[PDB]
Amino acid sequence: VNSFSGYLKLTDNVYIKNADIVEEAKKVKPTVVVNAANVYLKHGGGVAGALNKATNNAMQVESDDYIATNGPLKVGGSCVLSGHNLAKHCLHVVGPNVNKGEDIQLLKSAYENFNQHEVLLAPLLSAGIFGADPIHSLRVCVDTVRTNVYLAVFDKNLYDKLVSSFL
Ligand SMILES: O=C(O)c1ncccc1O
Numbered sequence: 232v233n234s235f236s237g238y239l240k241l242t243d244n245v246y247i248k249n250a251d252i253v254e255e256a257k258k259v260k261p262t263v264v265v266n267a268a269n270v271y272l273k274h275g276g277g278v279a280g281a282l283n284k285a286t287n288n289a290m291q292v293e294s295d296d297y298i299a300t301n302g303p304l305k306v307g308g309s310c311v312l313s314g315h316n317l318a319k320h321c322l323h324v325v326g327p328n329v330n331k332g333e334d335i336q337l338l339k340s341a342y343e344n345f346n347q348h349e350v351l352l353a354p355l356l357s358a359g360i361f362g363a364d365p366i367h368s369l370r371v372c373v374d375t376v377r378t379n380v381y382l383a384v385f386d387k388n389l390y391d392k393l394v395s396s397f398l
Pocket residue numbers: 250251252253277278281354355358359383384385386
């Protein structure tokens with residue numbers, strides 16, 4: 232049993248809810264919240280900008296020190312950093328950004344990072360301002376992630392379309 236409430240069950244291991252991931256993290260304090268990161272961990276907008284704002288910019292300060300030490304992530308890669316006031320840990324995962332011309336086949340690699348964590352609160356990778364089709368992102372999630380993932384979908388219209396169209 233866990234703390235997640237009001238989710239629709241899609242499969243054995245994937246759950247979905249119309250929710251603001253920031254507000255969901257604040258309520259649940261999950262072990263792991265996933266950030267929709269870029270390779271530079273520049274948390275300007277989208278999910279990343281919202282998570283970082285909720286940490287009062289402490290996520291960005293920590294991220295800048297990580298990049299200064301380790302250099303950029305890979306597209307499809309991830310790193311584990313603090314969850315600050317939102318979670319124990321934040322898993323920063325870089326999905327391909329279609330609006331930068333990145334290979335959508337890297338979306339599966341991105342989701343494979345989730346398998347290193349037993350339970351996660353996450354957004355749909357490469358959705359929103361990363362430009363991928365969210366229906367596709369949900370299909371890759373279900374077909375890649377084997378651990379227990381709680382997907383918070385910010386937009387109600389998109390949530391309803393994702394549920395209605397789910398095979
Ligand atoms: O549902 C999303 O894609 C989302 N986007 C931006 C900020 C928070 C979110 O949960």
